[PDB]
Amino acid sequence: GLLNLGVKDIGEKVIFDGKPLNSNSGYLGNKLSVSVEQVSIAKPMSNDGVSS
Amino acid sequence: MFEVPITLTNRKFAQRRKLKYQYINYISRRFDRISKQQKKRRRERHWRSVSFEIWRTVSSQNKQPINKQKMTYHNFKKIEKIPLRKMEIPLLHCTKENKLYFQSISRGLEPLKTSTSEVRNYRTRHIVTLTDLLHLNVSRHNWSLAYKIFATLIRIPGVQIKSLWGIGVEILDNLSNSSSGLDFLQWMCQIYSSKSRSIVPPFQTGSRTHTAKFAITYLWSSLINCQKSMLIDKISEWVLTPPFMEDAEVWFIYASCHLLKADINQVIKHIHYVRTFLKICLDKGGFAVPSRLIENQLKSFES
């Protein structure tokens, strides 16, 4: 499907915490990698209030 | 003499679990010391890991190494002596029976009455006999009586549906008069699959993580209603409304739907199809020893 191909194009979103680790030092901290994987669309469904 | 299928009780048992886990915490606290409330019970019970198709276990190989004596007499009684006293305070507020209960569980004795055994009373002792006669009649293949039992049971305002395999086999050997088997199964599934603590699960449960009973039982048994054939694209369309989609075993149910549809380029796409879900069910789970058997079958198909 297009979406699962579409999302595959977006790829990661990277941000750095910036913790020095205590090795000036070129260490940028932990690397967060944010990317989606696959997308699905549920058919229209009616849950009744809460309680699933 | 069998597990009861109603929510255990109100009574004492809470204050007993109080005493128990409170004292537990005082001893384990002073124990890490020397090694250097519903909520107290909650944190306490909390910080702890909570040729055939075997869900193989996790065996010993990268696990751990050996310990050597921690606990002489004179040194255990060290860790024991203080928390037992702090216990002497709220022990002063619980009841005599539970004073003695805590006393004995703390000496390391073990009770020989059960929570069922001691929860006395006209009504519950009657339910106890009702459910016994249920389990007995079902052992006896006396499906008729059995059924009567089950019906008077669930009629009672106390029983939660923890006795479903009760019907799922009972109504199953009762072709006779009642919508049945799959009726119950997919009913259970449809009702208890959404939002719409103790006293729980493996064979009952709610959403967000998996749900043995109703799910897998209707989810194969309908594929057995297709061994009734020699339906499928229905079972795989509404199987094909995931997600929990980590239900790897249901991935194998899906691949099974495709091997049964496969039994011209249509049949190709069905065998391509099963080839896909078998490995997307290498997700993990762990089935089918050699998939090369499934695949030797798929080559008998490839003919």
Pair (B170, B276) in one structural domain: yes
Residues B294 and B145 both lie in one domain = yes
**Residues of chain B contacting residue A51, judged by C-beta atoms under 8 Å apart:** 194-196
Candidates B199, B239, B196; CA nearest to A48 is B196
Residues B95 and B166 in one domain: no
The reply to whether B111 and B161 lie within a common domain is no
Task: Kindly state whether residues B110 and B189 are assigned to the same domain.
Answer: no
Please name the residue of chain B whose CA is at the shortest distance from the CA of residue A48. Answer: B196
Segment (H or E) for A43: none
Would B64 be classed as within a structural domain? no
Among A38, A46, A52, the strongest candidate for a mutation testing the B interface, having the largest count of B CBs within 10 A, is: A52
- Residues B3-16: b if buried by 16+ CB within 10 A, e if exposed: ebbbeeeeebeebb
**B103 and B185 part of one domain:** no
Same domain, B106 and B184: no
Q: How far does the CA of residue B140 sit from the closest CA of chain A (Å)?
A: 37
Return the number of CB contacts < 8 Å for A and B: 21
What is the domain range of residue B20? 10-50+72-120
Q: Are residues B126 and B172 in the same domain?
A: yes
Domain-embedded: residue B32: yes
Question: Is residue B3 in a domain?
Answer: no
Q: How many domains does chain B have?
A: 2
Q: What is the resolution of this structure in A?
A: 3.4
Picking from B120, B155, B177, the residue at the C-terminal end of a domain is: B120
Beta strands in chain B (DSSP E): none
In degrees, rounded to 5, the angle at the alpha carbon of residue B203 between the alpha carbons of residues B202 and B205 is 70
Asked whether residue B158 is domain-assigned, the answer is: yes
The reply to whether B252 and B157 lie within a common domain is yes
Same domain assignment for residues B76 and B127: no
Q: How many residues does chain A have?
A: 52
Domain limit, last residue, from B120, B150, B181: B120
A52 inside 8 A of chain B by CB: yes
Is residue B210 domain-shared with residue B227, that is, in the same domain? yes
Q: Are B34 and B71 in contact (CB under 8 A)?
A: no
Q: Between vectors from CA B95 to CA B2 and to CA B111, what angle results, nearest 5°?
A: 35
Query: Which residues in chain B are closer than 8 Å to A36, comparing Cβ atoms?
Result: none
- Cα B271 from Cα B265, distance rounded (Å): 10
DSSP B40-95: HHHHHHHSS-----------SSS----------HHHHHHHHHTHHHHTTTGGGTS-
Nearest CA in chain A to B194: A52
Instruction: Give the burial class of B285: count Cβ atoms within 10 A of its Cβ; 0-12 exposed, 13-18 middle, 19 or more buried.
Output: middle
- Within-domain flag for B2: no
Q: Which residues fall within 8 angstroms of residue B284, CB to CB, at 6 or more apart? A: B248
Nearest-CB residue to B194 (from A40, A42, A47): A47
Look at residue B66 and tell me if it is in a domain.
no
Residue that finishes a domain, picked among B86, B103, B120? B120
- Among B206, B242, B245, the residue with its CB nearest the CB of A52 is B206
Domain match, B199 and B244 both: yes
Structure token pair of residue B286: 């762990």
Is B180 part of a structural domain of the chain? yes
Which residue in A40, A42, A48 is closest to B196 by CB distance? A48
* CB-CB contact of B281 with B248 (8 Å): yes
